[PDB]
Amino acid sequence: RFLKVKNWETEVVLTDTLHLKSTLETGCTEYICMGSIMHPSVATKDQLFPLAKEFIDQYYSSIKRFGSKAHMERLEEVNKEIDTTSTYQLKDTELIYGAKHAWRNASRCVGRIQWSKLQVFDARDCTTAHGMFNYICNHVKYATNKGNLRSAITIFPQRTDGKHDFRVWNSQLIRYAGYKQPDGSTLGDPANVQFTEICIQQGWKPPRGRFDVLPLLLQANGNDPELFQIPPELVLEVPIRHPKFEWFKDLGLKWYGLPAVSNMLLEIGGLEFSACPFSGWYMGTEIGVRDYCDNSRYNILEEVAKKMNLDMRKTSSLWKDQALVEINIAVLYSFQSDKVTIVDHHSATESFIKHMENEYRCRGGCPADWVWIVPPMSGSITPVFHQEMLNYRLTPSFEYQPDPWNTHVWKLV
Amino acid sequence: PRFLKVKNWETEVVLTDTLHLKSTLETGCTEYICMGSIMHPSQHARRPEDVATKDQLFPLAKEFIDQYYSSIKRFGSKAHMERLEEVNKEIDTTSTYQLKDTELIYGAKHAWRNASRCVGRIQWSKLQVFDARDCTTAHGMFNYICNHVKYATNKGNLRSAITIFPQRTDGKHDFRVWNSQLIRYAGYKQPDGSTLGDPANVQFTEICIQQGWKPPRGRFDVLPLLLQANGNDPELFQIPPELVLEVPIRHPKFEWFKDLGLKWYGLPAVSNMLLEIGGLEFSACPFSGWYMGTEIGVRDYCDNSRYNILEEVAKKMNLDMRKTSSLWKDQALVEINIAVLYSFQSDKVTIVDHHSATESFIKHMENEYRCRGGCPADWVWIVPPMSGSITPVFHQEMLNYRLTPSFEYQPDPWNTHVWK
């Protein structure tokens, strides 16, 4: 069985063979499609043998050493551990191959043309929150690279019994605080209200300002998480100004420069890495459309259109649209001026289409999520809009996981 | 399964979907692979392409009559059981059956209601059905279409209408509108390599000139109708222009915009789909509503393979066009959709912007979950081609499934027509 996807802008057609090699579900059924559902739906020794065999097989295939003496020895070696220890350990090479392919298989990621240039920071020797703080700081300093961003992931000890998980309680490493006011308004980032509350509660002395960098909240080996303030000289920030509008700098906006996801789970060979913060660089619309303009978030459209003398009475004037465009010009122009790496939604999408042709050619497919790949503004004038994409889940994968405050049971009396 | 919840990540509203249990045919998806962005994911059809046997056709018929009498508080009534036997006899002697007039309107309004790709479904029960099953010629098809176009245009106060020609019989006597929409502009290939007019319609314009249409060869030449009746060679007809409402596009601020020289037509009328009810297939069924602004201004004007007027506009706006990062396409694309909306409203011609229309679809969604237990939706299609995340629907989970009666795709007839 093969499968064809079409680009209706170019008529190009690709043949996905790779979809045959996927295992866990997409959510969809034969008769219902869950392609827009955000979240649809500890392994024993016997569970873990075939998963590990799948990954070791895949690894030695990738390096044209399948069925070799070095392959068949490793297979025996992994079974020895799963028999003995009821788990096993990845070699360093495997953990780099695994982290890279988990990015490769991220169907919601438009930046995967860069996947093979991932810097893997092995942190599986870490034992304390202070250890995690150190590793993360060096990750940030490395990845930030004085505005010239580099992709990296730092991987902490895998799961054991689920009672001793390393976790980064932050959703991303660098995020701004939210505080809800007595009158009901929200200062800073309304998304991080709940997380700001935990921080404050644990010790944090908040500045109570509009762009406070949250502290890291870190859990090592299943113990109560611990607070740490990222040294400010390592948090690269960009103050947002518009090249046409002088008044724009007076909106007082900035953003962090380094997008670093820390709440997800890295699954390689049946092993789960519950704290695996990874990072790259930003696409313009992530800040300019979602962070700044979503009604749940910084929600600055009215403020901006007002300073634009826009008729904000009826919707058909497209004031919201007109203002959104200007704001993403601000974000790109601001980053570019402070020489902070960034990619606009056009450049990014054109790259992804090339990556996708490329991947269908050497790899035989590339699982994509149209609902996520298409930018959240100017959708149809980017090429991915006209690109049919097959969605399936390959492993290694990045996975969602419970929020650790809903699950953790506290030590401290 | 048992109940699937959908959720709106901007209001945390959750909706519980049971309507999907009554879904009859495949989506294209499997538990191991999602096809939600394939345009034609499936070829699962409820009956073979040609005249079907009794056990092939009756059960679909039994399915629809049963659902219709259910819809109107019967089921088991004398009129329902007499109907079931009437469809039995009628298939037992003509290999098809005929829909009562109540039955025909029910299915039509429900094919719209079930159309998961239509953001405009909140109006579904206010459809006007023109029964055209007594039709026998391309000339009759032209008369019926003409009245439709006049009723629906209503001097700019658009009304939704569908006109239903005779159901497919053995397949060789198909009725077909060969136009994709009733009113579309022409596409002319240029001797250099460029294109004049709407390049989506080049292959069609060719067939029309080839059939003897004398092309005026401009950028907004309304195309002729090519109408096929009872399997016979199709016939050209010019729609009288006093019936084709057109809006010249101007801009409320840029007075230079009127000189781009663009207009659009007011009546979106889809005429190439196949309406299916109780296993019957109405291969010709033009239907019309009113435009969402983006359709014209985002897709029609701004796709590369369409009119592609982006750079020509950005020039007049004097935009930084060296590199993408200046968002010059983004910037022009907004002015264009403001222009379109402003022109339609200034000519009192019905139109709906993307914000109003998407909000309404959220309300439709509630209405449907409250009374029906669900509402099938195609997120990929419902979200507008610009400014997605600032509209309500971008943040709303949607469940997609195939209910019958439905509107189906069908091959372009010239791929499958045996000319006379």
Ligand code: HEM
């Ligand atoms: C190098 C430049 C990168 C760019 C431009 C980029 C871009 C993006 C964007 C725009 C999204 C959508 C996220 C959202 O809107 O919430 C995304 C999702 C994602 N990216 Fe990338 N990314 C990059 C690097 C990486 C790296 C290094 C990894 C993994 C190590 C990664 C893995 C993912 C994953 C797993 C998702 C899905 C997020 C989710 O499902 O919530 N990306 N990416």
Ligand code: HEM
């Ligand atoms: C009354 C106002 C209406 C609005 C605002 C509206 C809006 C839309 C839009 C914007 C699309 C996507 C079109 C595209 O980009 O190709 C669509 C699709 C569709 N609409 Fe509606 N529509 C309306 C009326 C109707 C009516 C009267 C019918 C049938 C009686 C209908 C049936 C459909 C179908 C079947 C599709 C899918 C088209 C396809 O698959 O190619 N709509 N609608």
Ligand SMILES: CNCc1cc(F)c(F)c(-c2cc(C)cc(N)n2)c1
């Ligand atoms: C919870 N949604 C996931 C999510 C939220 C964000 F804010 C992000 F920034 C990214 C993201 C991640 C990477 C590695 C690069 C990039 N450009 N974006 C992903």
Ligand SMILES: CNCc1cc(F)c(F)c(-c2cc(C)cc(N)n2)c1
């Ligand atoms: C080929 N896809 C279908 C398609 C193409 C178009 F050009 C349209 F205009 C519409 C359409 C149809 C109706 C009834 C209302 C509306 N607002 N749009 C649909």
Ligand SMILES: C[C@H](O)[C@H](O)[C@H]1CNc2nc(N)[nH]c(=O)c2N1
């Ligand atoms: C590949 C993708 O599914 C395809 O381009 C679809 C996406 N969604 C769409 N949505 C609408 N309304 N109209 C379209 O033509 C498309 N095209």
Ligand SMILES: C[C@H](O)[C@H](O)[C@H]1CNc2nc(N)[nH]c(=O)c2N1
């Ligand atoms: C419900 C729907 O799946 C949800 O709104 C998704 C749509 N696509 C997205 N795409 C990106 N990149 N980010 C998002 O948060 C979302 N949200």
Ligand SMILES: [Zn+2]
């Ligand atoms: Zn699906």
